[PDB]
Amino acid sequence: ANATVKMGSDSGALVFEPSTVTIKAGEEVKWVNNKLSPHNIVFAADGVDADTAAKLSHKGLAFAAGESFTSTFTEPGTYTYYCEPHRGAGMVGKVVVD
Ligand SMILES: [Cu+2]
């Protein structure tokens, strides 16, 4: 049972919601595209290893109100994701794989 995040409120404010998710080692997590596009979900190697952070990242440009991404949360650890454009605009989210 994957967690589901949305890249922006299903209204019109760019917030990652849920901004922090906790799910199990080996499960996956989905993201839903909404509004204020483009967004991407770009994981900084935020304590976790480069390769895992990379493979979990999505530099895919999400234009279609319908496109959704999935990441495999194998390695227990912290992954911290942001948007490339909105990186430092307060648009960030966090993952705790258990
Ligand atoms: Cu964004």
Dist. CA 34–CA 46, nearest whole Å: 25
Residue found under tokens 């952070």: 53
Whether a cis peptide bond, with omega within 30° of 0, leads into 38 is yes
Active site residues: 39, 83, 86, 91
Total count of domains within the chain: 1
- Measured between alpha carbons, how far is 41 from 73 in angstroms, rounded to an integer? 14
91 C-alpha vs ligand 1 centroid, how far in Å?
A: 6
Experimental method: NMR
Among the listed residues 20, 34, 10, the one whose alpha carbon sits nearest the alpha carbon of residue 92 = 20
Token code pair at residue 93:
């989210």
Confirm if 51 and 66 have CB atoms less than 8 A apart.
no
Q: Which residues are documented as binding site?
A: 39, 83, 86, 91
Residue-number span of the structural domain to which 63 is assigned: 1-98
10 Å Cβ neighbour count for 61? Answer: 12
Distance CA 44, CA 62 (A): 19
Q: How many CB atoms neighbour CB 96 within 10 A?
A: 13
- CATH number assigned to the domain comprising residue 55: 2.60.40.420
**What residues pair up with 45 in beta bridges, in sequence order?**
none
From the CA of 25, how far away is ligand 1's center (Å)?
27
